[PDB]
Design a protein around this nucleic acid. Structure first.
Ligand code: ZN
Length: 19
DNA sequence: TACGCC
């Protein structure tokens, strides 16, 4: 629960995008 | 911000 690729409550994919 | 992708 958090990011998509990172693993932290920083943001979601539209704010990450980080592959 | 960058693949929402590996
Ligand atoms: Zn992330």
């Amino acid at each position: 629960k958090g990011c998509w690729k990172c693993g932290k409550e920083g943001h979601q994919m539209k704010d990450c995008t980080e592959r």
